[PDB]
Structure 1
Amino acid sequence: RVSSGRDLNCVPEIADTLGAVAKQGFDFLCMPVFHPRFKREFIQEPAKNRPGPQTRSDLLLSGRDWNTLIVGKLSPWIRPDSKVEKIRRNSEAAMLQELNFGAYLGLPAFLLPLNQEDNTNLARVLTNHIHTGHHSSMFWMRVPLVAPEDLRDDIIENAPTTHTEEYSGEEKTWMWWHNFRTLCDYSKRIAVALEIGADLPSNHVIDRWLGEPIKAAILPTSIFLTNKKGFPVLSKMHQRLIFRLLKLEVQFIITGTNHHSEKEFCSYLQYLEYLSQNRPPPNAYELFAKGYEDYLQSPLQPLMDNLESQTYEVFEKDPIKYSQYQQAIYKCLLDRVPEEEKDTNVQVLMVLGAGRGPLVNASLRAAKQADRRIKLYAVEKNPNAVVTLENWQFEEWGSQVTVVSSDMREWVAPEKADIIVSELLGSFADNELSPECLDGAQHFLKDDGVSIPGEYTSFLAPISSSKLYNEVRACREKDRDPEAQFEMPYVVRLHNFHQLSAPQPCFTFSHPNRDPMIDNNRYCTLEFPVEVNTVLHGFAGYFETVLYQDITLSIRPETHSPGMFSWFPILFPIKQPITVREGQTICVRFWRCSNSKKVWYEWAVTAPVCSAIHNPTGRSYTIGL
């Protein structure tokens, strides 16, 4: 279903108009709080002392109706950035009067236009209104995809329209919004009310609004086409943008008079509900990811902290992940012991970090499939998780599985293992300390021993998201550094964002580590080519892992394992947003630092401009050993 609203600049009777738009199927109504032609004077007499009321009474609608159904609208004559000082001063007082009346009514949203380049004084008055009392009210900035000057009819003889291609000039309305929100210091109360024109601009202009806080999409009746039956429809390119906006869960607003006189106003909404029902249904990943879209989570630390029972339950409800692990052991058993040794040779399996026993059960199913003899060792450091393993061992597994309640780095094994199985990987592969754990465990692995996984690589990609940057900015906590939130990674289902370049490999680890002097510390320099004008907010982290031979698991968008949803992408943000031009290259430097007690990540941007080294000495973020 689509949450819709009706935009009207003419309301004679508030009770009759709201009742009429509700009958058409509109969830809300965008209407003016004061008459759009009623120009008010605040300085010069006798126009200053005009007899009241200044507008209609608040008693006309109930408190609930103002809080949910009415969306405010700023008067068109209010021009705080006018060249005339008299209009500039009067518009300031009128803007405050209208915004304070909207806060008085308790409206959920208020519309303000961005129809020109200079909106500095408009930003000054709005920022001052937000800092005058603590409120949750939203402010939708009415900004079009194409400026009205760039979509005008070529009918002026002496002043013709510019037919030449202007890459930066075509994205001018995005700069109007960007300058406005920067002046307002990225306020969470300020969102985008994107107006769609009759003719859509180039794909790069539409891509500028990716990662931007769009809460409303304005669709005029003039942009709608007419089919053979007479119903209002849209072009295939216009439909593509509707499906893109539906994913962001925006509120579609209909403006302008009915041009399809044979049909009612509900016909425009009937087509939007039709597109919402005829869109591709959410897959196994898309249904699980619901609710966690752009929701920041702290990366799990299973070594330092003992995880809850429900955290293991979420880990277990992934069939694709453990099906691959089962196939990896099944392929390894046949390669290690042949058909002639299927009853005389028994392979020593060691599940390092057993948890509740999903890999232990997967090792048993792999042995039945390959028809080979196995001896399991279920090692686990969490005593609470060991309670589940020992109850599983007594009731079902039997003497075949040996439950060990110890750390893999401190445990002394009675015999050497042929295969070591583990699931110590996180969103950034080695972020949950998989190398350090297996380095102090590979001593009890045989000289020809195999590790599952045997290899893993992390991947980084530059991203643009003003929504996620503001989400990280709001993660400021007391009794710590006021900028510590930017110097730490986050496991997040990245939704409202834009991938600026293809993911490149960052850090790689192989098990067993045959190196004489094993060093898990790393330094990587990545050069990302950017073919778009954008603003860098952070770096998305992914991972690829080789369990055994061709059997792999991946969260990288290009090679993502279908149906797998155990790991959401990781996010490494930056303290200050970096402006990146078309053709420029983003250079990021990533470090994997460590000592005897902790492991951490350090990162810094060196091109186009330099950024500060984030998380130095692990001051804001550390993964304890």
Structure 2
Amino acid sequence: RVSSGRDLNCVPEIADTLGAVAKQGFDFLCMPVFHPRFKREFIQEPAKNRPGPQTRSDLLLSGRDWNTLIVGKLSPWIRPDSKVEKIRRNSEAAMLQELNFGAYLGLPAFLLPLNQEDNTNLARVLTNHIHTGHHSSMFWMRVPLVAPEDLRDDIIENAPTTHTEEYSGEEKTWMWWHNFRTLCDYSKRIAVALEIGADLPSNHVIDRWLGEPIKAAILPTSIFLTNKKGFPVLSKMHQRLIFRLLKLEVQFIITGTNHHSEKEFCSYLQYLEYLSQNRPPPNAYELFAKGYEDYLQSPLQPLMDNLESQTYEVFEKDPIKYSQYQQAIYKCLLDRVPEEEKDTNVQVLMVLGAGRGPLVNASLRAAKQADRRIKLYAVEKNPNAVVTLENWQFEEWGSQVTVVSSDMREWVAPEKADIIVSELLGSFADNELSPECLDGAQHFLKDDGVSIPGEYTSFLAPISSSKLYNEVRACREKDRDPEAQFEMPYVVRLHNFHQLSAPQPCFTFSHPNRDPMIDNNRYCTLEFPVEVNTVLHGFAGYFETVLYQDITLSIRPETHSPGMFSWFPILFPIKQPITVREGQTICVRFWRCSNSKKVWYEWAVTAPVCSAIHNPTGRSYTIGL
């Protein structure tokens, strides 16, 4: 359940070294395509004409071996950011040479070091290489958690290490990475190979790499311990970090020599793989939604569109969600009719937006266990789902369920509603126009009628995710505004992200609205205290809803309804990422706008730096009325 790699910087013979690495239990091998000590001269005339092959044959491995087993390493002497010019241009021509040989071999990944602050000329040559051919190979940048200058032993008399807390200086390696990728314009082929030090840094420094495209974790043999039995082990602190990585499904890579006579590299993995089993399988919600991690989708629009048969099916694969509805109705039924009026007072229940009728059946089970009599209207506008309803009224429901095929805003009802039941809420609560729908349907709800859900609330929280920022950035399509993908929300099971503040309420709607004058236009102004240095990429959205009384449904992480995978969080992006210092406040503003044809969201950032107003006039995203 763990994919691991072996980092070597010494191969005498590929086929004999790779065969060794394979038997020990490794999925791939990181090795130098060129001899690490083979400095080559490209300009200077005595040494430019060095004879012989510049490296070993490609024939030493099969085609699929290079494609799936081998991760290239760029030679340690390549220093394109050197202060000496001759070293710069040799490093330039040689970095291109090594990189071009990796693409020649079809290697899936290439390792590049980020061991100093300035890799500007490094980023450049790399970028040109990315923009020469159109390829999909990845580039793993080695960046350690703690810089080599901040880990050195305090054994120099006249240069003692700084014992003070450099809060932003302890995060300095992240700045190496951030500046590198920003120079490379967020190329999808450039990911992080995080090197784990013997002694870990501060918690914020580790938190810094939340949301970053970490494809690999480097585990040197030196950071391992020795249990009472004499085998390599890891501290609880270190183990927690690995557990955190396990959640991102990074590949785990061992580097350095093994100091144990009891030798054998499998033990180092034996403990590592061992850890995966120890991590609890599954987290319940995680099992079902696997493969949807960080997967961008357009939010469903049941009103404007007609949902397919299999999206109604996934809706029903959540009993927990309906139990709350069942219970809310249950509780409500008892409240409205007393025990002596039980068999005389029949209640008009109306499932507005019945779909394939899970709500109508939950309304039936609620009436049975409440021992009160109900007349039930199943109202659905999607003609295709109505076919399921009418087949299921005829076969089993009978005349207790009346199926109505119309829009609830248009539908004239024969009877007034004792209770109306709605499932209209979206990921961001009202993004599915549940307000406008239930509003136009209040007229057939009697004056003391209960609407389920009574209210719902949208929540917002700023997030940091360079991973997710590329995916939106990759969403550009032809025949449309090149930035329109940034001005539209997405429903997505957020995974590799970092929440930057506690979710705050955004919009609220109460049904029945009543009010002399109903207006679903909204202005809400939020301020999010941020206690860490970071980069703002977007705002995650959740919702809480109160079906009736205490019963509720929620995807807000603090009050997340346990065991409910029915809804995913929504993500509002911003065109340009915004850097945020510790102690700064993220002020965001959101608008719910509407005309007579459509409803949309506008949003902007007025915090540390202003951001353009997103989706103005609904130019890039509408919710059709």
Secondary structure of the 1:110 match is strand
Secondary structure of the 1:210 match is coil
**CA–CA distance in 1 between the matches of 2:508 and 2:550?**
17
Alpha-carbon displacement from aligned partner over 1:239-297 (angstroms, at most 9, x marks no partner): 00000001100111101111111231211010001101111221321111210000001
**CA–CA distance in 2 between the matches of 1:22 and 1:262?**
19
**CA–CA distance in 1 between the matches of 2:64 and 2:262?**
35
The alignment status of 1:561 with 2:561, answered yes or no, reads yes
Secondary structure of the 1:407 match is coil
**CA–CA distance in 2 between the matches of 1:454 and 1:555?**
17
Moved more, 34-43 or 283-292: 283-292
**CA–CA distance in 1 between the matches of 2:353 and 2:98?**
62
User: CA shift at 1:92, angstroms?
Assistant: 0.2
**CA–CA distance in 1 between the matches of 2:171 and 2:344?**
72
**CA–CA distance in 1 between the matches of 2:350 and 2:236?**
56
Contact 1:231 1:263 in 2 (8 A): no
**CA–CA distance in 2 between the matches of 1:93 and 1:297?**
43
**CA–CA distance in 2 between the matches of 1:304 and 1:569?**
21
TM-score normalized by the length of structure 2: 1.00
**CA–CA distance in 1 between the matches of 2:262 and 2:305?**
66
**CA–CA distance in 2 between the matches of 1:515 and 1:54?**
81
User: CA shift at 1:514, angstroms?
Assistant: 1.3
**Aligned position for 1:365:** 365
**CA–CA distance in 2 between the matches of 1:86 and 1:304?**
64
User: CA shift at 1:464, angstroms?
Assistant: 0.1
- Give the 5 Å matches for 1:414-429: 414-429=414-429
**CA–CA distance in 2 between the matches of 1:14 and 1:438?**
69
User: CA shift at 1:227, angstroms?
Assistant: 1.0
**CA–CA distance in 1 between the matches of 2:60 and 2:35?**
16
**CA–CA distance in 2 between the matches of 1:504 and 1:621?**
23
Secondary structure of the 2:606 match is strand
**CA–CA distance in 2 between the matches of 1:603 and 1:322?**
33
Secondary structure of the 1:31 match is strand
Unaligned runs of 5+ in 1: none
User: CA shift at 1:106, angstroms?
Assistant: 0.2
Secondary structure of the 1:456 match is strand
* Total equivalences in the alignment: 625
**CA–CA distance in 1 between the matches of 2:104 and 2:292?**
34
User: CA shift at 1:19, angstroms?
Assistant: 0.4
**CA–CA distance in 2 between the matches of 1:343 and 1:266?**
72
**CA–CA distance in 1 between the matches of 2:16 and 2:584?**
56
**CA–CA distance in 1 between the matches of 2:6 and 2:334?**
67
**CA–CA distance in 2 between the matches of 1:88 and 1:556?**
52
**CA–CA distance in 2 between the matches of 1:25 and 1:282?**
25
Secondary structure of the 1:340 match is coil
Moved more, 146-155 or 253-262: 253-262
**Aligned position for 2:90:** 90
* Structure 1 stretches of 4+ moved >6 Å: none
Contact 1:6 1:21 in 2 (8 A): yes
User: CA shift at 1:113, angstroms?
Assistant: 0.1
User: CA shift at 1:150, angstroms?
Assistant: 0.3
**CA–CA distance in 2 between the matches of 1:345 and 1:14?**
84
User: CA shift at 1:381, angstroms?
Assistant: 0.5
Secondary structure of the 2:340 match is helix
**Aligned position for 1:176:** 176
- Give the 5 Å matches for 1:541-620: 541-620=541-620
**CA–CA distance in 2 between the matches of 1:237 and 1:293?**
26
Unaligned runs of 5+ in 2: none
Alpha-carbon displacement from aligned partner over 1:486-527 (angstroms, at most 9, x marks no partner): 000000000000000000000000000111110000000000
**CA–CA distance in 1 between the matches of 2:267 and 2:348?**
69
**CA–CA distance in 2 between the matches of 1:133 and 1:242?**
36
Alpha-carbon displacement from aligned partner over 1:565-620 (angstroms, at most 9, x marks no partner): 11000000000000000000000000000000000000000011100000000000
Alpha-carbon displacement from aligned partner over 1:140-175 (angstroms, at most 9, x marks no partner): 000000001100011100110100111000000000
User: CA shift at 1:545, angstroms?
Assistant: 0.2
Contact 1:528 1:586 in 2 (8 A): yes
Contact 1:81 1:120 in 2 (8 A): yes
**CA–CA distance in 2 between the matches of 1:513 and 1:245?**
47
**CA–CA distance in 1 between the matches of 2:544 and 2:426?**
11
Contact 1:141 1:193 in 2 (8 A): yes
**CA–CA distance in 2 between the matches of 1:412 and 1:15?**
78
User: CA shift at 1:197, angstroms?
Assistant: 0.4
| RMSD of Structure 2 on Structure 1 (CA) | 0.5
**CA–CA distance in 2 between the matches of 1:29 and 1:20?**
10
TM-score normalized by the length of structure 1: 1.00
Alpha-carbon displacement from aligned partner over 1:533-579 (angstroms, at most 9, x marks no partner): 00000000000000000000000000001111110000000000000
